[PDB]
Amino acid sequence: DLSISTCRIMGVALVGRNKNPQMNFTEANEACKMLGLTLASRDQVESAQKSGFETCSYGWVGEQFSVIPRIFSNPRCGKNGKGVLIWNAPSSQKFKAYCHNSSDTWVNSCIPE
């Protein structure tokens, strides 16, 4: 089974395997597709972060690098950074995935508008 953000922010969810190992770029893309989603772009993750989305996991985006959205600094998440922090790693490296749902119309899929 996959782990997924319960509430998507600006259409974005963190998607991971339930246990290690995580996913190379191809595998992350395929996880999003299996859910009927696409791999999110860096811009989509940034829009989510600007509406309150943060995680402590690096995940693939469509630009073929990994990102982490951070609002609060934490030494163990994005090396204490804030914003959407980038890790340029080979496509073979394992990360989670950021997926985007183009059908979402709410800022937070758990907060009705």
Ligand SMILES: *[C@@H]1O[C@H](CO)[C@@H](O)[C@H](O)[C@H]1NC(C)=O
């Ligand atoms: C990614 O993982 C798949 C296994 O699901 C493998 O077939 C593929 O070669 C891997 N790609 C890279 C670049 O390591």
Ligand SMILES: *[C@@H]1O[C@H](CO)[C@@H](O)[C@H](O)[C@H]1NC(C)=O
């Ligand atoms: C995608 O968003 C639509 C509309 O909010 C929702 O009905 C659907 O369940 C979502 N699917 C996933 C996999 O997030």
Ligand SMILES: [Cl-]
């Ligand atoms: Cl959407």
